[PDB]
Design a protein around this ligand. Structure first.
Ligand code: CDL
Ligand code: CDL
Ligand code: PC1
Lengths: 57, 459
């Protein structure tokens, strides 16, 4: 009483009911490096300009 | 200082829009109005320098150099136009544009609040001067006389450029107003020794120093009259102004690094005066006399006492007027005998009496006849160097003896004796030439009535 499957059936993606817990960190990675602080705050004008030797603006 | 920088630039449309007969007259008139306007810089105070802006200021040192600079431009225009009578009109306007551009560079050279703007303007004054010399010169070797004058003022100012940016990163500023209050004493080290050399050698070349004076009698001889006037009166004095600004940052290493330079200057003011005794060329004699007089200014800045700075700035202003009048008198004879040989034209007082009186006055100011400001500067430098060391009075009085000798020898050789028989193109003195001599000499005699305006920041 076995039935040979149709074409395209054995390549279907099935769902599996498992009882083992999910691997929370399967790459066994350490903690990520902390990212650099972003930019924030209103962009004020440059204090006294270019400050390049004498150029006052 | 913008009220002087803008009309100097307005002299460019005033010289490129005038009629073909009006370009000398308009530029002369409006540069005389600018020179009249320049007297507003005498708003000087006993404690606080006249500080205009973040870019420009004028204490009592830069103020007489500015008034001399803005006064010298009409005098150069009156002096240079007779030998440009056979000149093209557009080349004539380019000549006046180089003079106006040089004035524009100088009037914001001396008012440089910040030192790298002083460096840019200090090295930018060369290019109009170089164009005037190597384009309206006389002889074959005007290219060599302009080559070394570009070479020495860049090979000497290449350590000056490196040293100023080194202070920009260390002290954080090159504002001289800030650097009066944040100056650190410069300790004894070899690094600070080459720091002192980098700060001082460019201005030593510009004065000139003895041994480094080889560019100057060549460059004056290959120059026209406007180039000779501005070199004798302003462009040597750039080096004295720069040393008086730059020795603030160089203490106390100057008090033992000045000894070879003071010995060079003290022996060179003897040697160049003896060369002035042994000259055949009149313009070279005035050139070596200028080296002899600027050697005292180098000594007075290196000993850095108050009498020495007062005498050095008085001597710079006085020598500017005197040497400019001497080069103009040399031109007034080169426009008649067409050669610079001093023994060629003799006995000129029999022919040009009033011009001989102007020669007499210029030579008496050149030997520091009291109470002229030549004598005020000479005497104060001699007082301060007597305070430095009591045995310097031998070289000082010996230089004053030889100075009297070559000034009166120049006077006698051109103006006295039996005249040359085979010269007959000696025209009478023009009204232009006598006006030029009087505009040199009459302010130089009026400044003896009130010499306090030419005695610098520490009067
Ligand atoms: C309500 C609505 C309406 C409101 C309207 C309000 C205004 C109404 C009036 C309208 C007109 C406004 C004009 C502009 C504002 C004022 C500009 C000004 O005077 O600045 C002074 C400016 C700063 O002086 P300040 O006393 O410290 O401040 C006064 C102001 O507050 C200066 O203000 P600042 O602090 O904000 O200035 C910023 C900064 C101030 O500067 C700095 O912080 C230092 C940097 C300056 C440049 C240094 C370069 C050095 C090396 C290169 C040298 C090149 C050769 C030199 C020139 C050769 C001949 C061109 O500027 C720059 O860096 C710009 C570069 C310099 C150009 C200045 C303006 C030029 C306009 C005309 C161009 C003609 C050529 C001028 C020469 C330019 C080259 C020098 O002076 C200089 O830097 C000296 C240089 C020359 C001054 C230019 C004069 C402008 C007018 C010229 C007219 C005649 C031209 C004749 C023909 C051309 C020559 C053949
Ligand atoms: C603020 C108001 C001020 C008002 C007062 C003025 C203050 C002084 C200003 C300038 C003065 C000198 C101008 C004249 C000499 C140059 C021109 C010339 O050749 O004249 C001969 C000529 C007359 O001779 P000529 O027969 O017709 O022809 C001449 C021959 O061809 C050939 O001629 P020569 O060589 O056979 O004969 C010329 C003779 C030749 O003799 C000399 O050169 C000998 C002089 C030196 C040795 C003797 C004096 C030594 C020192 C003692 C005096 C100072 C101390 C006194 C104080 C009290 C005690 C401490 O020289 C003189 O006669 C001039 C003597 C007076 C000048 C002072 C000494 C100059 C020497 C060098 C500098 C010395 C240190 C500075 C002294 C500064 C004093 C203010 O004079 C005129 O035609 C006059 C022209 C107009 C002159 C205007 C002068 C002022 C202009 C300033 C305008 C803006 C301010 C407004 C005030 C205007 C007031 C009028
Ligand atoms: C000599 C011609 C160039 C001189 C330029 C000197 C410029 C300057 O600021 O010198 C002080 C500087 C000071 O050097 P420094 O301050 O960088 O020294 C190292 C810093 N410490 C001491 C704190 C560790 O000295 C030099 O630049 C010395 C080298 C001279 C320049 C190259 C010479 C080439 C051959 C001639």
């Amino acid at each position: 009483g076995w039935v040979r499957p149709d074409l395209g059936e054995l390549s279907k993606v099935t769902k599996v009911k498992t009882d083992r817990p999910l691997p929370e960190n399967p790459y066994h990675s350490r903690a990520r490096p902390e990212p650099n602080p972003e930019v924030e705050g209103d962009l004020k004008p440059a204090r006294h300009g270019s400050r390049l030797f004498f150029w006052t603006m | 200082m913008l009220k002087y920088i803008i009309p100097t630039m307005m002299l460019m449309p005033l010289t490129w829009l005038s009629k073909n007969s009006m370009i000398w007259i308009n530029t002369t008139l409006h540069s005389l109005l600018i020179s009249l306007t320049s007297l507003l810089l005498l708003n000087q105070f006993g404690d606080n320098s006249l500080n205009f802006s973040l870019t420009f200021f004028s204490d009592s040192l830069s103020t007489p150099l500015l008034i001399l600079t803005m006064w010298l431009l009409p005098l150069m225009l009156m002096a240079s136009q007779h030998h440009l009578s056979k000149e093209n009109l557009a080349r004539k306007k380019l000549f006046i544009s180089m003079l106006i551009l040089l004035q524009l560079f100088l009037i914001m050279t001396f008012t440089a609040t910040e030192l790298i703007f002083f460096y840019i303007m200090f090295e930018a004054t060369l290019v109009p001067t170089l164009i005037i010399i190597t384009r309206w010169g006389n002889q074959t070797e005007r290219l060599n006389a302009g080559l070394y004058f570009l070479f020495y003022t860049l090979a000497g100012s290449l350590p000056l450029l490196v040293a100023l940016i080194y202070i920009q990163n260390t002290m954080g500023s090159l504002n001289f107003l800030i650097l009066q209050y944040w100056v650190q004493p410069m300790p004894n080290s070899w690094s600070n020794t080459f720091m002192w050399l980098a700060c001082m050698m460019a201005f030593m070349v510009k004065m000139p120093l003895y041994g480094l004076h080889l560019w100057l009698p060549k460059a004056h001889v290959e120059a026209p009259i406007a180039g000779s006037m501005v070199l004798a009166a302003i462009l040597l004095k750039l080096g004295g102004y720069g040393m008086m600004r730059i020795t603030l940052l160089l203490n106390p290493i100057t008090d033992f690094m000045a000894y070879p330079f003071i010995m060079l200057s003290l022996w060179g003011m003897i040697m160049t005066s003896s060369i002035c005794l042994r000259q055949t060329d009149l313009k070279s004699l005035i050139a070596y006399s200028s080296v002899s007089h600027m050697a005292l200014v180098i000594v007075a800045i290196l000993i850095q006492t108050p009498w020495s700075y007062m005498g050095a700035t008085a001597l710079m202003i006085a020598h500017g007027l005197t040497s400019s009048m001497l080069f103009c008198l040399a031109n007034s004879n080169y426009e008649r005998v067409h050669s610079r040989t001093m023994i060629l034209a003799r006995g000129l007082q029999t022919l040009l009496p009033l011009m001989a009186a102007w020669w007499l006055l210029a030579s008496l100011t050149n030997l520091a006849l009291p109470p002229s400001i030549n004598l005020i500067g000479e005497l104060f430098v001699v007082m301060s160097t007597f305070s430095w060391s009591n045995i310097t009075i031998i070289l000082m009085g010996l230089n004053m003896v030889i100075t009297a000798l070559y000034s009166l020898y120049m006077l006698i050789t051109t103006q006295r004796g039996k005249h040359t028989h085979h010269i007959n193109n000696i025209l009478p003195s023009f009204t232009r030439e006598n006006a030029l001599m009087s505009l040199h000499m009459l302010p130089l005699l009026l400044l003896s009535l009130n010499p306090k305006i030419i005695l610098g920041p520490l009067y």
